[PDB]
Amino acid sequence: XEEXX
Amino acid sequence: XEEXX
Amino acid sequence: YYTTPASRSIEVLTLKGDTRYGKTLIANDGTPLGVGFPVGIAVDPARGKLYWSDHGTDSGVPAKIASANMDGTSLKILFTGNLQHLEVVTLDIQEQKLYWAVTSRGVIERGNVDGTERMILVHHLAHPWGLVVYGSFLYYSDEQYEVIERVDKSSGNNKVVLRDNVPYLRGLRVYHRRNAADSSNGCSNNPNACQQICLPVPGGMFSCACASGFKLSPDGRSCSPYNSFMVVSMLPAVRGFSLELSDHSEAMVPVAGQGRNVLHADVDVANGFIYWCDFSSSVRSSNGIRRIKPDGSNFTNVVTYGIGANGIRGVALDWAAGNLYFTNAFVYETLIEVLRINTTYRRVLLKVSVDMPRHIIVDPKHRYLFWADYGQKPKIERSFLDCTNRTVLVSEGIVTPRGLAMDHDTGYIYWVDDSLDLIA
Amino acid sequence: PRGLALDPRMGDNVMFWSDWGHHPRIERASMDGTMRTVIVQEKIYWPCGLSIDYPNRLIYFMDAYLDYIEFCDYDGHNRRQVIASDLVLHHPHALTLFEDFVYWTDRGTRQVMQANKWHGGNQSVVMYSVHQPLGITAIHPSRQPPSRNPCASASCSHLCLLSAQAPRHYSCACPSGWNLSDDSVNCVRGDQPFLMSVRDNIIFGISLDPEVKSNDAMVPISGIQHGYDVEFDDSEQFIYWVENPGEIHRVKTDGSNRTVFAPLSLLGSSLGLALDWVSRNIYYTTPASRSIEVLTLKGDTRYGKTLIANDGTPLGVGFPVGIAVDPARGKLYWSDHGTDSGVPAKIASANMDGTSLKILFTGNLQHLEVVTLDIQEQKLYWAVTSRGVIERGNVDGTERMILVHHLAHPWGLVVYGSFLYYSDEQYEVIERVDKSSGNNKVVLRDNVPYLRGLRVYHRRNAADSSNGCSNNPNACQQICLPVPGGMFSCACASGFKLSPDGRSCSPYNSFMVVSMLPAVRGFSLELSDHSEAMVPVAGQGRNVLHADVDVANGFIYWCDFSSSVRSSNGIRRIKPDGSNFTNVVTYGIGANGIRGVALDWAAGNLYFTNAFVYETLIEVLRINTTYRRVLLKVSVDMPRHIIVDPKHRYLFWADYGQKPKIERSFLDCTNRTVLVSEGIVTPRGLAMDHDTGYIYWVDDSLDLIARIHLDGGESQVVRYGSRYPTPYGITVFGESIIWVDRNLKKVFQASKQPGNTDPPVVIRDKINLLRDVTIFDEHAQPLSPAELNNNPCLQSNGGCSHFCFALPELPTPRCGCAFGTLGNDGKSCATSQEDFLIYSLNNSLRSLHFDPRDHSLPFQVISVAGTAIALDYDRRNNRIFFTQKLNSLRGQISYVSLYSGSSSPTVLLSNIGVTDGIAFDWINRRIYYSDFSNQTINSMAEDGSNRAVIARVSKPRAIVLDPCRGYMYWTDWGTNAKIERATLGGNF
Amino acid sequence: XXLXXX
Amino acid sequence: XXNXX
Numbered sequence A, B: 001x002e003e004x005x
Numbered sequence C: 001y002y003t004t005p006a007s008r009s010i011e012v013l014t015l016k017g018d019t020r021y022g023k024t025l026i027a028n029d030g031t032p033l034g035v036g037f038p039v040g041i042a043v044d045p046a047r048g049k050l051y052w053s054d055h056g057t058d059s060g061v062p063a064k065i066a067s068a069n070m071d072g073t074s075l076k077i078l079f080t081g082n083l084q085h086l087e088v089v090t091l092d093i094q095e096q097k098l099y100w101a102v103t104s105r106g107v108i109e110r111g112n113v114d115g116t117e118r119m120i121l122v123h124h125l126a127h128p129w130g131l132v133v134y135g136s137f138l139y140y141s142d143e144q145y146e147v148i149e150r151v152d153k154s155s156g157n158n159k160v161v162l163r164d165n166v167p168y169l170r171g172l173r174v175y176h177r178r179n180a181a182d183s184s185n186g187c188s189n190n191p192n193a194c195q196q197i198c199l200p201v202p203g204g205m206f207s208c209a210c211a212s213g214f215k216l217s218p219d220g221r222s223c224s225p226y227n228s229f230m231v232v233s234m235l236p237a238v239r240g241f242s243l244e245l246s247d248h249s250e251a252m253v254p255v256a257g258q259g260r261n262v263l264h265a266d267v268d269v270a271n272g273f274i275y276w277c278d279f280s281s282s283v284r285s286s287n288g289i290r291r292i293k294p295d296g297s298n299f300t301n302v303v304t305y306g307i308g309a310n311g312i313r314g315v316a317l318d319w320a321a322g323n324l325y326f327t328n329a330f331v332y333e334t335l336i337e338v339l340r341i342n343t344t345y346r347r348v349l350l351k352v353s354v355d356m357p358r359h360i361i362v363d364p365k366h367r368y369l370f371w372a373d374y375g376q377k378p379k380i381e382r383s384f385l386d387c388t389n390r391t392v393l394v395s396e397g398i399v400t401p402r403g404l405a406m407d408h409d410t411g412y413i414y415w416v417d418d419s420l421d422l423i424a
Numbered sequence D: 001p002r003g004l005a006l007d008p009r010m011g012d013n014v015m016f017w018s019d020w021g022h023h024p025r026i027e028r029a030s031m032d033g034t035m036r037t038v039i040v041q042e043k044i045y046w047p048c049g050l051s052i053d054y055p056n057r058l059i060y061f062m063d064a065y066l067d068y069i070e071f072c073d074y075d076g077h078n079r080r081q082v083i084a085s086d087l088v089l090h091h092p093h094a095l096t097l098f099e100d101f102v103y104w105t106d107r108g109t110r111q112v113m114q115a116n117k118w119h120g121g122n123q124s125v126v127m128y129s130v131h132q133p134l135g136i137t138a139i140h141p142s143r144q145p146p147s148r149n150p151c152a153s154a155s156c157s158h159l160c161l162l163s164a165q166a167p168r169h170y171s172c173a174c175p176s177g178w179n180l181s182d183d184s185v186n187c188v189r190g191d192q193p194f195l196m197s198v199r200d201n202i203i204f205g206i207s208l209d210p211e212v213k214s215n216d217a218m219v220p221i222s223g224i225q226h227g228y229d230v231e232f233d234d235s236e237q238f239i240y241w242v243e244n245p246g247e248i249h250r251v252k253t254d255g256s257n258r259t260v261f262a263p264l265s266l267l268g269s270s271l272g273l274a275l276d277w278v279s280r281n282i283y284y285t286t287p288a289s290r291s292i293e294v295l296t297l298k299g300d301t302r303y304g305k306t307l308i309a310n311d312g313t314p315l316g317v318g319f320p321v322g323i324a325v326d327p328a329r330g331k332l333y334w335s336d337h338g339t340d341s342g343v344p345a346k347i348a349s350a351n352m353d354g355t356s357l358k359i360l361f362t363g364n365l366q367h368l369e370v371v372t373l374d375i376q377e378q379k380l381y382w383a384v385t386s387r388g389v390i391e392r393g394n395v396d397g398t399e400r401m402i403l404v405h406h407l408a409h410p411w412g413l414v415v416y417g418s419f420l421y422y423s424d425e426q427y428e429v430i431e432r433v434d435k436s437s438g439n440n441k442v443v444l445r446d447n448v449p450y451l452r453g454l455r456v457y458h459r460r461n462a463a464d465s466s467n468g469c470s471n472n473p474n475a476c477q478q479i480c481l482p483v484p485g486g487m488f489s490c491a492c493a494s495g496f497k498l499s500p501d502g503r504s505c506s507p508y509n510s511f512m513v514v515s516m517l518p519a520v521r522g523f524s525l526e527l528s529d530h531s532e533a534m535v536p537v538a539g540q541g542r543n544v545l546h547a548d549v550d551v552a553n554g555f556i557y558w559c560d561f562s563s564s565v566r567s568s569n570g571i572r573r574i575k576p577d578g579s580n581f582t583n584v585v586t587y588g589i590g591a592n593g594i595r596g597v598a599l600d601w602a603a604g605n606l607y608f609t610n611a612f613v614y615e616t617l618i619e620v621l622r623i624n625t626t627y628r629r630v631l632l633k634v635s636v637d638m639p640r641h642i643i644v645d646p647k648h649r650y651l652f653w654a655d656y657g658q659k660p661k662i663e664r665s666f667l668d669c670t671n672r673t674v675l676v677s678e679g680i681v682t683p684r685g686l687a688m689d690h691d692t693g694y695i696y697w698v699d700d701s702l703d704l705i706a707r708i709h710l711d712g713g714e715s716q717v718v719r720y721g722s723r724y725p726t727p728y729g730i731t732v733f734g735e736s737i738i739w740v741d742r743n744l745k746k747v748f749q750a751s752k753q754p755g756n757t758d759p760p761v762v763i764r765d766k767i768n769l770l771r772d773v774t775i776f777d778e779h780a781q782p783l784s785p786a787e788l789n790n791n792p793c794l795q796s797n798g799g800c801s802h803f804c805f806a807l808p809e810l811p812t813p814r815c816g817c818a819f820g821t822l823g824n825d826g827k828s829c830a831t832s833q834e835d836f837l838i839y840s841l842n843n844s845l846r847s848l849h850f851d852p853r854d855h856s857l858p859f860q861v862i863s864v865a866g867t868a869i870a871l872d873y874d875r876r877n878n879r880i881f882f883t884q885k886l887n888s889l890r891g892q893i894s895y896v897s898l899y900s901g902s903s904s905p906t907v908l909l910s911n912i913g914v915t916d917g918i919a920f921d922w923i924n925r926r927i928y929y930s931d932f933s934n935q936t937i938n939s940m941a942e943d944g945s946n947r948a949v950i951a952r953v954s955k956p957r958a959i960v961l962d963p964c965r966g967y968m969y970w971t972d973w974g975t976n977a978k979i980e981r982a983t984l985g986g987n988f
Numbered sequence E: 001x002x003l004x005x006x
Numbered sequence F: 001x002x003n004x005x
């Protein structure tokens, strides 16, 4: 639900 | 088969 | 007017009447004056000029800003040089100056329509995706800065931000009161003069044009179907080009879309039909022979039953007797079959396992049938029209011949040989 | 060529092979390949699987298209069919013989069959295979008949091949690249040059003579993944090429000593290669990281240094393609694709030490190709695919001119002797042409697909081209680099800085730390230095959000994040030169990973923020210890990026949540004050200058870089406008601020004072997924009490046991307790001795206070074997009885003492089974437990003896008791679920 | 099956 | 689901 990549 | 594109 | 980089052409479409007519104006020929990879396009209806920004092609067209008549009959290169990754081109009709965005250098440049006085207006941009000139101001959008900005048209000074923190910015245009009476041309002065398409040209004149598959009659006003054109067949589509190289119009409605894996094509000039064979190694429905008029009507499946695993590998129409010779190839054997057009009659004329005829041509003038073999014993073989009295024309110095042609006037057999790189 | 059979008996000495190309045929030749003869060429389509019947001197052959097995004599005259017009054969591949049977493998039926060798009768299946059987052989002495060896008396230097020639029945030969000498018994190495033509998956060595088509100048290098370039060292006979994972591979020209030589770069895959044969160094390009770097070949240990990088200037590396070096002149040349708003497409030059960058040729150079150098003539050659030409120019940047034109797609280019060689990927051709105005065109090879770069293998004398590094061996500790004029500049591998000696290396001690999602990288604060100031933290499992440093101890801390793989979330540390990789925090990471890392260098405390789905925690971990404590636990607020400052003893964090703000608090997350709450939307990074006490933060939602004093008040704008779209992280060093921008893919530097209008200077350009920036310097992390305002935690943790928290104006610290309750002395920790809560968590026992606002653990987590299930506490002895579930079939009842004193759990009863309930009778000192597997409630004494059964129920759970009234209660959750009451004896 | 082994 | 441990 917040950032990744 | 030769060309199936 | 619109550009299609997939087909590498600049096309015109009418929106006046009830029936939509489309035509290709400039196409990717060999010369640098053609279309390499069109990005943007701007028009000057009052003067009959067309401008477009073009990327380059390898060994062909350079990246450039180009000008042409709106009927496409006078190509010109205006500006070339440091134009890597060109963006759309916009035209200021009032002052007659062009504006471009060069992403590689991150600048917006300006130049006159005649190819003079090129100069850099705005510096230090990141990705100026779109721009437009209205009044005394220039509006541009930067995709990486995520900003829409207004600057003076005479200099990049007096910058003003309109929107910011907006993602996925793209091209820009100004909806304003463009008047169809203050700007006039030959097509406006002469309505319903041309049958299908009217295209203005410099000097206040106009030139008539016809949709794809149609060409101007000698009267200069009417359209007639194309009579002499080449049929170029490729895997995704079948396309037709004029046999005189100055005309870039599509001489035939392109046979394309889902399900097209065209291997070979043949023509029936008298009845006005183009025959082609689709091939799919997975879907059994996409195997067979189909035909269509050059104008795109009366589509029909000609052969659909009994096609081998390797599919139809060559089609040749006997325009004199109405016979359509084709080669049906299986895993370990190959058939040569005849179908009589507009009949249900169909029979096999030869079955061979060691040989493999692939591309076949017919000559009713000499009553002979020729096919090219690229199996374990490559050869060019000739037989009667019933495939019954066979002889070998070429048996040595030939590896993988995948094309044949007949001269019909000198009696020679031309073939292309891609394994030895020659035409003989 | 597929089939192959031999008859090495002294009389015959012949070899048979089968070819199934166009015009299929079976050929016979002498064992030395002299008397080549085609024996069968009729009625064959797909020949395969030859085999020889030695007693009868017949050759058996097989066809997979016509589906037959046949044999004939050695001349092919007496052909016979053993299996023909038979449906057993589908796609036979191999054949072998024994006595009166022929064994063959069929690729269609995937089975091995057997039949009579003369008429094909008695067919049977030998075995069925799930995979296609390719090769078959019959091992028996009859298949290797003895014979005289004519090579025994032979004196051939390398190879003695048998032959059908009568007088000797043998012939001397030698490997690829050797000459048969006139004496015809000895062979000498051929020193002539040859052309290496690397393809997409193979590298070939072909002769410069266009009339020779053998492709056997050297043993081919197969197995290439994506071949673009090749390099050679004529001495030591080694060939070099790169591979996809970022490695360089090495093999000799004779095919031996194939090995992985050294890893090239962790940030991507290399493209080009250039070898300095005089100083024994190799230069290569890394288009992924947009840098040029050199690797040392001389020594046993490898050293790598990034020479030139993308610093945003025109004089720099935009997208390097190919390198050419002039070791005598000390110059390095490379062809470069341009970058947007950056380096143009150019041919550039530099000294081989990375200095004196220069632009030679720029202009019509779209789709550039490899550059090459004519060292004798001092001219550069390059190909331009967009124009289909080969161009030539002097090394000084003059006399640019077109040499070869009307090409399709040049890929390879090399000039040797008086000729120019180029490989054209389209036209599928390798071609030779004069270097003087490009006439006299000659074709070497054609119809060869997947053509790539070219290079000529030839003998180079380092003695006739010596330079500074060769004249001064062992002068430099790690890397020697030649310099124009005969000089040399010593260098150090990535992560090391050159000592003042100029000959020795020392680790970097002043550099910036830049963290990206793929990797963590370090750059020197001296902008002219393009070398990597840290061994990059790159590889599988790296997804970096923030990075922090411990300058005194030499560590870099970073937190990984992953929303899919749970095990790849946590806090890691590593030395700047690699060395001690370590996991710091791995347990209890929330659904969202660690969102901020702050290290207190004075106290050794590490502050981090972990975010759960609907809440977040701020936690301290003391370095090199198991002490972890939660300081603040909030749900409406969301601290993301947290910084610590031991000098003023404060904690700052950004929020960017539903109520964005920048908060201030003590070192224990107490006294929370709000600094800025207006004009803030998305603060993503905080920074502080220790000498001025200003909080620097960035906000990409407002495109703002602003500062506010540590005491609060006015917020001052430092950088503002549309030219700063996404500032993600920021640090302050000296008089400058340094921030990373994701959209611009740049690391910027600008003055820290507000109101400045000078444009920022780019440190590095074209870096993807920038996340943060951090300074690694002693001045950024002082430790002396003079400037740290006499921080009490410096002196042996301030005397505290678990945690030391200093207060901004007090001389004494507040000792924090990770587990237990702080003692009366204010520094020691002991068990709570209060009323609290206990519970089980997999293989451990954990405690919890009744106060939701109290985050201290009543006691440290107790580790047990198996899985603890049910709990009960004995007041008299301070022990807790708990069941352990093992292998889902057995269980134990164990107790552990809460007096601590190094007490460990011990078992009271074993071999029970699944047990989900315990209740201890504090009056009668009996333990009541519910054996679920055995379906009864049982009672035993406190010592574990005289166990007795109370009652039998379907599915027991949750026993409670009341000895003062002699009743026990339990829950049965089977069919007809109910709560049952019985006396403590199990009656009624 | 194709008689090529690769 | 299952009412196990």
Ligand SMILES: *[C@@H]1O[C@H](CO)[C@@H](O)[C@H](O[C@@H]2O[C@H](CO)[C@@H](O[C@@H]3O[C@H](CO[C@H]4O[C@H](CO)[C@@H](O)[C@H](O)[C@@H]4O)[C@@H](O)[C@H](O[C@H]4O[C@H](CO)[C@@H](O)[C@H](O)[C@@H]4O)[C@@H]3O)[C@H](O)[C@H]2NC(C)=O)[C@H]1NC(C)=O
Pocket (backbone or CB within 6 Å): C268, C270, C271, C272, C273, C298, C322, C341, C342
């Ligand atoms: C097999 O079946 C397919 C199924 O569709 C049939 O298509 C095909 O039958 C028909 O074959 C004839 C061959 O003559 C085709 O007729 C010709 O059409 C030409 C095009 O006609 C169009 O343009 C003209 C322009 O003047 C216009 O007048 C027409 O109204 C129409 O728009 C036409 O030019 C040509 O005329 C010649 O022959 C006429 C014979 O009466 C003369 O009057 C005329 O002066 C001129 O000499 C001719 O009519 C026909 O198109 C085609 N059917 C269809 C629907 O296309 C079958 N034949 C085979 C074996 O393929």
Ligand SMILES: *[C@@H]1O[C@H](CO)[C@@H](O[C@@H]2O[C@H](CO)[C@@H](O[C@@H]3O[C@H](CO[C@H]4O[C@H](CO)[C@@H](O)[C@H](O)[C@@H]4O)[C@@H](O)[C@H](O[C@H]4O[C@H](CO)[C@@H](O)[C@H](O)[C@@H]4O)[C@@H]3O)[C@H](O)[C@H]2NC(C)=O)[C@H](O)[C@H]1NC(C)=O
Pocket (backbone or CB within 6 Å): D178, D179, D188, D189, D190, D191, D192, D193, D207, D208, D209, D210
């Ligand atoms: C191992 O076996 C091979 C095959 O026989 C030999 O290779 C040949 O060796 C000779 C001598 O080294 C080479 O001759 C040299 O050719 C150079 C030009 O090469 C071009 O032209 C020749 C034909 O003349 C082509 O074969 C070749 O492909 C090129 O197109 C010349 O420039 C050389 O001249 C130099 O030396 C002479 C004599 O001292 C001087 O007069 C000149 O000024 C100049 O300095 C020379 O003539 C020949 O090219 C090689 N052929 C091959 C296959 O490359 C090896 O010699 C042999 N080695 C051993 C140990 O036996």
Ligand SMILES: *[C@@H]1O[C@H](CO)[C@@H](O[C@@H]2O[C@H](CO)[C@@H](O[C@@H]3O[C@H](CO[C@H]4O[C@H](CO)[C@@H](O)[C@H](O)[C@@H]4O)[C@@H](O)[C@H](O[C@H]4O[C@H](CO)[C@@H](O)[C@H](O)[C@@H]4O)[C@@H]3O)[C@H](O)[C@H]2NC(C)=O)[C@H](O)[C@H]1NC(C)=O
Pocket (backbone or CB within 6 Å): D552, D553, D575, D580, D604, D623, D624
């Ligand atoms: C948690 O535990 C880790 C270990 O797992 C600790 O990490 C160690 O931290 C110490 C800090 O002192 C490091 O030691 C320092 O290394 C420096 C570099 O040493 C190299 O260079 C010197 C000089 O040429 C050589 O002599 C040496 O052999 C090495 O080649 C030294 O410069 C430092 O010296 C200073 O301190 C020492 C006392 O420690 C004095 O004797 C010296 O006079 C001088 O003042 C120092 O030796 C050590 O390298 C780290 N080890 C690892 C494995 O990284 C952490 O410190 C600890 N966590 C916390 C927060 O304390």
Ligand SMILES: *[C@@H]1O[C@H](CO)[C@@H](O)[C@H](O[C@@H]2O[C@H](CO)[C@@H](O)[C@H](O)[C@H]2NC(C)=O)[C@H]1NC(C)=O
Pocket (backbone or CB within 6 Å): D842, D843, D864, D865, D866, D867
């Ligand atoms: C939970 O408890 C079980 C039973 O005691 C325990 O096995 C798990 O710890 C580890 O699980 C690993 C995977 O099976 C195993 O490889 C490892 O040996 C094991 N450790 C011990 C002490 O046996 C516990 N897992 C968790 C997630 O806490």
Ligand SMILES: *[C@@H]1O[C@H](CO)[C@@H](O[C@@H]2O[C@H](CO)[C@@H](O)[C@H](O)[C@H]2NC(C)=O)[C@H](O)[C@H]1NC(C)=O
Pocket (backbone or CB within 6 Å): D121, D122
């Ligand atoms: C192998 O095959 C041969 C035939 O090629 C078999 O010989 C025949 O066997 C039958 C049954 O006994 C006799 O009636 C015939 O007279 C035999 N001769 C021929 C040529 O048909 C032989 O029995 C087989 N052997 C095995 C073990 O399979």
Ligand SMILES: *[C@@H]1O[C@H](CO)[C@@H](O[C@@H]2O[C@H](CO)[C@@H](O)[C@H](O)[C@H]2NC(C)=O)[C@H](O)[C@H]1NC(C)=O
Pocket (backbone or CB within 6 Å): D256, D257
């Ligand atoms: C190339 O490989 C060969 C074979 O391994 C090496 O030659 C011998 O290797 C053995 C085993 O390592 C050693 O005991 C011998 O001393 C080696 N002999 C020689 C003459 O070197 C050889 O060292 C390798 N060469 C390189 C440079 O890789």
Ligand SMILES: *[C@@H]1O[C@H](CO)[C@@H](O)[C@H](O)[C@H]1NC(C)=O
Pocket (backbone or CB within 6 Å): C297, C298
């Ligand atoms: C061919 O197409 C035209 C126009 O759609 C249609 O009127 C005509 O009936 C078609 N002819 C046949 C034979 O289907």
Ligand SMILES: *[C@@H]1O[C@H](CO)[C@@H](O)[C@H](O)[C@H]1NC(C)=O
Pocket (backbone or CB within 6 Å): C389
């Ligand atoms: C056709 O074959 C016949 C035999 O059936 C042969 O006599 C004649 O020569 C052949 N004709 C030609 C034109 O080759």
Ligand SMILES: *[C@@H]1O[C@H](CO)[C@@H](O)[C@H](O)[C@H]1NC(C)=O
Pocket (backbone or CB within 6 Å): D579, D580
């Ligand atoms: C760190 O790495 C060095 C070199 O590998 C090793 O000697 C040392 O024991 C390691 N120290 C720790 C505590 O991991």
Ligand SMILES: *[C@@H]1O[C@H](CO)[C@@H](O)[C@H](O)[C@H]1NC(C)=O
Pocket (backbone or CB within 6 Å): D671
């Ligand atoms: C800090 O918190 C304490 C306790 O709430 C309070 O007395 C004090 O006024 C606050 N301010 C500071 C900075 O001491």
Ligand SMILES: *[C@@H]1O[C@H](CO)[C@@H](O)[C@H](O)[C@H]1NC(C)=O
Pocket (backbone or CB within 6 Å): D911, D912, D913, D933, D934, D935
């Ligand atoms: C429960 O049932 C059996 C039979 O009474 C007994 O022998 C066993 O020890 C008990 N527990 C287990 C392990 O099944």
Ligand SMILES: [Ca+2]
Pocket (backbone or CB within 6 Å): D064, D065, D066, D067, D089, D090, D091
């Ligand atoms: Ca078969």
Ligand SMILES: [Ca+2]
Pocket (backbone or CB within 6 Å): C146, C165, D700, D701, D702, D703, D724, D725, D726
């Ligand atoms: Ca923004």
Ligand code: NI
Pocket (backbone or CB within 6 Å): C085, C086, C087, C103, C127, C129
């Ligand atoms: Ni763009």
Ligand code: NI
Pocket (backbone or CB within 6 Å): D367, D368, D369, D385, D409, D410, D411
């Ligand atoms: Ni290329």
